[PDB]
Short mmCIF file of C-alpha atoms in Angstrom, two decimals:
data_model
loop_
_atom_site.label_atom_id
_atom_site.label_comp_id
_atom_site.label_asym_id
_atom_site.label_seq_id
_atom_site.Cartn_x
_atom_site.Cartn_y
_atom_site.Cartn_z
CA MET A 204 16.82 -8.57 14.31
CA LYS A 205 17.45 -7.55 10.71
CA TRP A 206 14.51 -8.42 8.46
CA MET A 207 15.45 -9.26 4.86
CA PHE A 208 11.99 -8.19 3.65
CA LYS A 209 12.54 -4.66 5.01
CA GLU A 210 16.06 -4.52 3.66
CA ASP A 211 14.71 -5.54 0.24
CA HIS A 212 11.97 -2.85 0.00
CA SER A 213 11.31 0.75 0.82
CA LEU A 214 8.89 1.58 3.58
CA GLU A 215 6.59 3.05 0.94
CA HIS A 216 6.77 -0.07 -1.19
CA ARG A 217 5.84 -2.17 1.84
CA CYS A 218 2.94 0.12 2.81
CA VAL A 219 1.35 0.00 -0.66
CA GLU A 220 1.90 -3.78 -0.80
CA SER A 221 0.11 -4.51 2.47
CA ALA A 222 -2.57 -1.93 1.78
CA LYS A 223 -3.35 -3.53 -1.59
CA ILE A 224 -3.46 -7.03 -0.14
CA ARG A 225 -5.57 -5.87 2.86
CA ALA A 226 -8.07 -4.13 0.58
CA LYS A 227 -8.21 -7.12 -1.75
CA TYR A 228 -8.30 -9.89 0.95
CA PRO A 229 -10.02 -8.30 3.97
CA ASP A 230 -10.35 -11.65 5.81
CA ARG A 231 -6.62 -12.44 5.63
CA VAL A 232 -3.49 -10.90 7.09
CA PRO A 233 -0.09 -10.50 5.42
CA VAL A 234 2.78 -12.01 7.46
CA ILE A 235 6.54 -12.10 7.09
CA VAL A 236 8.29 -15.09 8.68
CA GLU A 237 12.02 -15.11 9.37
CA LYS A 238 14.05 -17.49 11.47
CA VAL A 239 15.93 -15.87 14.36
CA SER A 240 19.33 -14.65 13.18
CA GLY A 241 22.01 -16.91 14.59
CA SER A 242 19.62 -19.66 15.71
CA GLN A 243 20.24 -23.34 15.04
CA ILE A 244 16.78 -24.26 13.68
CA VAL A 245 16.42 -25.10 9.97
CA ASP A 246 15.46 -22.17 7.76
CA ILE A 247 12.14 -21.80 5.93
CA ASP A 248 11.84 -21.60 2.14
CA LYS A 249 9.11 -18.95 1.83
CA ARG A 250 8.95 -15.78 3.96
CA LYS A 251 5.70 -14.11 2.84
CA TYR A 252 2.29 -15.46 3.76
CA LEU A 253 -1.36 -14.52 3.41
CA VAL A 254 -2.93 -16.08 6.49
CA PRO A 255 -6.68 -16.48 7.20
CA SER A 256 -7.50 -14.10 10.03
CA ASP A 257 -9.46 -16.70 11.94
CA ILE A 258 -6.71 -19.25 12.51
CA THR A 259 -4.99 -19.15 15.87
CA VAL A 260 -1.36 -18.31 16.61
CA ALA A 261 -1.02 -21.88 17.85
CA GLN A 262 -2.30 -23.13 14.48
CA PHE A 263 0.08 -20.85 12.58
CA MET A 264 2.96 -22.24 14.62
CA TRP A 265 1.92 -25.69 13.43
CA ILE A 266 1.85 -24.49 9.80
CA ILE A 267 5.42 -23.24 10.20
CA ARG A 268 6.53 -26.49 11.89
CA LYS A 269 5.11 -28.37 8.89
CA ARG A 270 6.77 -26.04 6.37
CA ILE A 271 10.23 -26.67 7.89
CA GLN A 272 9.47 -30.36 8.68
CA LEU A 273 10.60 -29.84 12.28
CA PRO A 274 10.46 -33.27 14.01
CA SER A 275 7.73 -33.34 16.63
CA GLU A 276 10.17 -33.90 19.51
CA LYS A 277 11.83 -30.50 18.88
CA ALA A 278 10.31 -27.27 20.19
CA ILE A 279 9.51 -24.17 18.15
CA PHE A 280 8.85 -20.62 19.34
CA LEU A 281 7.38 -17.59 17.58
CA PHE A 282 8.27 -14.01 18.56
CA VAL A 283 6.40 -10.83 17.60
CA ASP A 284 7.59 -7.40 18.68
CA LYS A 285 10.22 -8.93 20.95
CA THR A 286 7.82 -11.16 22.92
CA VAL A 287 6.07 -14.53 22.74
CA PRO A 288 2.55 -13.99 21.31
CA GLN A 289 -0.47 -15.48 23.06
CA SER A 290 -1.02 -18.87 21.32
CA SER A 291 -4.83 -18.68 21.59
CA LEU A 292 -5.15 -15.33 19.79
CA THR A 293 -6.31 -15.50 16.21
CA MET A 294 -3.90 -14.24 13.58
CA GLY A 295 -6.36 -11.44 12.84
CA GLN A 296 -6.24 -10.37 16.49
CA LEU A 297 -2.45 -10.63 16.63
CA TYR A 298 -2.27 -8.58 13.40
CA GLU A 299 -4.40 -5.77 14.80
CA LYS A 300 -2.40 -5.72 18.04
CA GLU A 301 1.19 -6.06 16.64
CA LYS A 302 1.22 -5.15 12.92
CA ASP A 303 4.21 -3.09 11.75
CA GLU A 304 3.69 0.49 10.66
CA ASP A 305 4.20 -0.92 7.15
CA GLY A 306 1.04 -3.03 7.45
CA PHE A 307 2.81 -6.40 7.64
CA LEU A 308 2.90 -8.62 10.74
CA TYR A 309 6.50 -9.80 11.35
CA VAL A 310 6.87 -13.23 12.98
CA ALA A 311 10.28 -14.58 13.94
CA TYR A 312 10.73 -18.23 14.89
CA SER A 313 13.39 -20.38 16.51
CA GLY A 314 14.05 -23.64 18.25
CA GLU A 315 15.40 -23.89 21.77
CA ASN A 316 18.08 -21.43 20.76
CA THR A 317 21.06 -21.59 23.13
CA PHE A 318 21.69 -17.92 22.35
CA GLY A 319 18.26 -16.68 23.40
CA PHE A 320 16.46 -14.02 21.32
CA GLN B 33 -4.58 -9.90 -13.70
CA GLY B 34 -2.58 -7.16 -12.00
CA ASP B 35 -3.89 -4.52 -9.62
CA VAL B 36 -3.28 -0.83 -10.31
CA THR B 37 -2.61 1.79 -7.60
CA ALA B 38 -3.29 5.47 -8.28
CA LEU B 39 -1.87 7.73 -5.58
CA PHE B 40 -3.16 11.27 -5.05
CA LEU B 41 -0.34 13.42 -3.72
CA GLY B 42 -0.51 17.10 -2.77
CA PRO B 43 -0.78 19.57 0.11
CA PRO B 44 -2.86 18.82 3.20
CA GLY B 45 -6.32 20.23 3.47
CA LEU B 46 -7.28 19.98 -0.20
CA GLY B 47 -9.87 17.29 0.37
CA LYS B 48 -8.03 14.38 -1.19
CA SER B 49 -9.86 11.73 0.93
CA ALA B 50 -13.24 13.17 0.03
CA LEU B 51 -12.21 13.30 -3.63
CA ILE B 52 -11.34 9.58 -3.47
CA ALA B 53 -14.64 8.79 -1.78
CA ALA B 54 -16.54 10.80 -4.40
CA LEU B 55 -14.69 8.89 -7.12
CA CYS B 56 -15.56 5.56 -5.52
CA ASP B 57 -19.16 6.36 -4.49
CA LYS B 58 -20.63 5.03 -7.75
CA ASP B 59 -18.72 1.73 -7.77
CA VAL B 60 -19.85 -1.88 -7.30
CA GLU B 61 -17.33 -2.50 -4.48
CA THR B 62 -19.13 0.18 -2.38
CA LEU B 63 -21.94 -2.39 -2.26
CA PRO B 64 -2.14 4.50 3.45
CA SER B 65 -5.75 3.27 3.03
CA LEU B 66 -6.60 2.10 -0.49
CA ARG B 67 -10.15 2.20 -1.83
CA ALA B 68 -11.31 0.13 -4.78
CA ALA B 69 -12.55 2.16 -7.70
CA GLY B 70 -13.70 -0.65 -9.94
CA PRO B 71 -11.95 -3.93 -10.67
CA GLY B 72 -8.18 -3.80 -10.69
CA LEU B 73 -7.83 -0.19 -9.45
CA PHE B 74 -7.16 1.07 -5.92
CA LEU B 75 -6.94 4.77 -5.00
CA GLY B 76 -4.88 6.16 -2.11
CA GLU B 77 -3.81 9.62 -0.94
CA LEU B 78 -0.82 11.13 0.92
CA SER B 79 -0.38 14.71 2.10
CA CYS B 80 2.90 16.19 0.83
CA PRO B 81 4.04 18.03 2.93
CA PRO B 82 4.87 16.43 5.23
CA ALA B 83 5.47 13.13 3.39
CA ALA B 84 8.34 13.20 0.89
CA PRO B 85 6.52 12.69 -2.42
CA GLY B 86 9.34 10.93 -4.28
CA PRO B 87 9.26 7.55 -2.56
CA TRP B 88 5.47 7.39 -2.68
CA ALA B 89 5.18 8.47 -6.29
CA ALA B 90 7.70 5.73 -7.12
CA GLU B 91 4.95 3.26 -6.05
CA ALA B 92 2.15 4.94 -8.01
CA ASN B 93 1.11 3.14 -11.21
CA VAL B 94 -0.90 6.28 -11.92
CA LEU B 95 0.12 9.59 -10.31
CA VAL B 96 -2.50 12.21 -9.53
CA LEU B 97 -1.29 15.64 -8.37
CA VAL B 98 -3.78 17.56 -6.26
CA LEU B 99 -3.00 21.22 -6.41
CA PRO B 100 -4.28 24.38 -4.71
CA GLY B 101 -4.97 27.64 -6.46
CA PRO B 102 -2.76 30.71 -6.43
CA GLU B 103 -4.45 32.15 -3.33
CA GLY B 104 -2.73 29.58 -1.14
CA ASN B 105 0.25 30.04 1.10
CA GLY B 106 3.29 29.46 -1.03
CA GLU B 107 2.94 28.15 -4.59
CA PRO B 108 0.87 25.31 -5.93
CA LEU B 109 3.58 22.89 -7.13
CA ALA B 110 6.23 22.38 -4.45
CA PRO B 111 9.71 21.53 -5.76
CA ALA B 112 9.77 17.95 -4.43
CA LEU B 113 6.31 17.24 -5.85
CA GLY B 114 7.30 18.67 -9.26
CA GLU B 115 10.40 16.53 -9.29
CA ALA B 116 8.40 13.42 -8.38
CA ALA B 117 5.97 14.16 -11.22
CA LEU B 118 8.85 14.60 -13.68
CA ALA B 119 10.23 11.23 -12.53
CA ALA B 120 6.86 9.55 -13.10
CA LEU B 121 6.64 11.04 -16.58
CA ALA B 122 10.21 9.92 -17.37
CA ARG B 123 9.33 6.35 -16.58
CA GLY B 124 6.06 6.44 -18.47
CA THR B 125 3.70 6.54 -15.47
CA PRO B 126 0.44 8.28 -16.45
CA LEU B 127 0.14 11.70 -14.83
CA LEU B 128 -3.08 13.51 -13.89
CA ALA B 129 -3.58 16.79 -12.04
CA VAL B 130 -6.64 18.04 -10.10
CA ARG B 131 -7.86 21.46 -9.01
CA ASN B 132 -10.74 20.91 -6.60
CA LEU B 133 -12.44 24.28 -6.48
CA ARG B 134 -14.62 24.96 -3.49
CA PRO B 135 -17.22 27.56 -2.36
CA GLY B 136 -16.12 31.16 -2.72
CA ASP B 137 -12.93 30.71 -4.73
CA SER B 138 -11.27 33.69 -6.40
CA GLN B 139 -11.16 31.71 -9.65
CA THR B 140 -13.77 30.54 -12.09
CA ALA B 141 -13.27 27.04 -13.39
CA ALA B 142 -11.99 28.63 -16.61
CA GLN B 143 -9.36 30.77 -14.87
CA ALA B 144 -8.19 27.91 -12.66
CA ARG B 145 -7.81 25.76 -15.76
CA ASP B 146 -5.90 28.33 -17.79
CA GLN B 147 -3.57 29.28 -14.95
CA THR B 148 -3.00 25.75 -13.70
CA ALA B 149 -2.51 24.46 -17.26
CA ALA B 150 0.13 27.16 -17.78
CA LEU B 151 1.85 26.39 -14.50
CA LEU B 152 2.05 22.69 -15.28
CA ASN B 153 3.32 23.32 -18.77
CA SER B 154 6.00 25.69 -17.49
CA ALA B 155 7.17 22.98 -15.03
CA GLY B 156 7.58 20.38 -17.86
CA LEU B 157 4.31 18.59 -16.85
CA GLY B 158 2.31 19.72 -19.92
CA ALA B 159 1.46 16.06 -20.57
CA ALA B 160 -0.54 15.94 -17.31
CA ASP B 161 -4.28 15.55 -17.90
CA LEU B 162 -5.82 18.44 -15.93
CA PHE B 163 -9.18 18.17 -14.17
CA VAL B 164 -10.87 21.24 -12.67
CA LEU B 165 -13.80 20.31 -10.39
CA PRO B 166 -16.26 23.17 -9.83
CA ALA B 167 -17.17 24.25 -6.34
CA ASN B 168 -20.64 22.75 -6.89
CA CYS B 169 -19.21 19.29 -7.63
CA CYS B 170 -20.41 16.63 -12.19
CA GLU B 171 -19.02 16.35 -15.76
CA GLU B 172 -15.40 16.89 -14.73
CA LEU B 173 -15.63 14.39 -11.87
CA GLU B 174 -17.04 11.73 -14.19
CA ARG B 175 -14.31 12.48 -16.73
CA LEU B 176 -11.76 11.96 -13.95
CA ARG B 177 -13.33 8.66 -12.89
CA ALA B 178 -13.34 7.40 -16.49
CA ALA B 179 -9.77 8.59 -17.16
CA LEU B 180 -8.53 6.76 -14.04
CA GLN B 181 -10.36 3.61 -15.04
CA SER B 182 -9.18 3.63 -18.63
CA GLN B 183 -5.54 4.31 -17.64
CA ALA B 184 -5.82 1.39 -15.22
CA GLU B 185 -7.38 -0.95 -17.84
CA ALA B 186 -4.25 -0.44 -19.96
CA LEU B 187 -1.70 -0.96 -17.18
CA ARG B 188 -3.01 -4.23 -15.67
CA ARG B 189 -1.10 -6.37 -18.16
CA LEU B 190 2.24 -4.85 -17.05
CA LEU B 191 1.66 -5.52 -13.35
CA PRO B 192 1.47 -8.62 -11.15
CA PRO B 193 -1.54 -9.43 -8.98
CA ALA B 194 -1.34 -8.12 -5.43
CA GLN B 195 -0.92 -11.75 -4.15
CA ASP B 196 2.28 -11.95 -6.16
CA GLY B 197 4.78 -13.78 -4.07
CA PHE B 198 2.44 -14.40 -1.13
CA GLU B 199 1.87 -17.98 -0.02
CA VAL B 200 -1.95 -17.95 0.18
CA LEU B 201 -2.87 -20.41 2.94
#
């Protein structure tokens, strides 16, 4: 799963970026969102989010659904470190458990992708 | 409206974390991990070795070298760290250097200053502002704090806020 964000920035650049935003907004978590390479679901305009730590994974999935205007009768999935995150975790909890070494949390999403993940 | 990052780079074991804490102890916020040292200024540190200094220094809006004295194993300014400091200077990044003396050092503050000033000059880093903290540390520490803050006041207008590009939900 190539991540454009990582391709676009050095590891050091990403570390200082997340560190600055974590020091400055301690109640929020920095998140990169990318659709699954090769999947059929519509793409999302913005990749980089500052998400309140107290909202749940389930609620973040609804924010993403709204950002891509996914009709309600289509399914969406999020994936973090190769697995489906627990929907009832808060984003702060998910961040602490699955954050990248660069200090960002990387969330991929797809629809019912015929090609899996 | 931008936020400034000063990175302290230099050998392990020189007390860079405690230096950053001492610098931040008298700040209103106290009421790589970055610590706020007054509005608009974050301080971080990386031990080089083993981190390659170049890619980190490239992210420093202010670059602070932390250097040992001559007694140490090797030499105080490692090649990669000297080259990273030259690259900062070339691009106009403000450069500071620190000698953090500590109990029972072979060098008085005066000797450490003269020898470290000479070393820096000979490596093309004569424009580095050199701070020599006595073992007892103080006046030099407060000069360092104020130099960091004033360099950062000037740079904020060149730099975006940290939220730049983030969708803030």
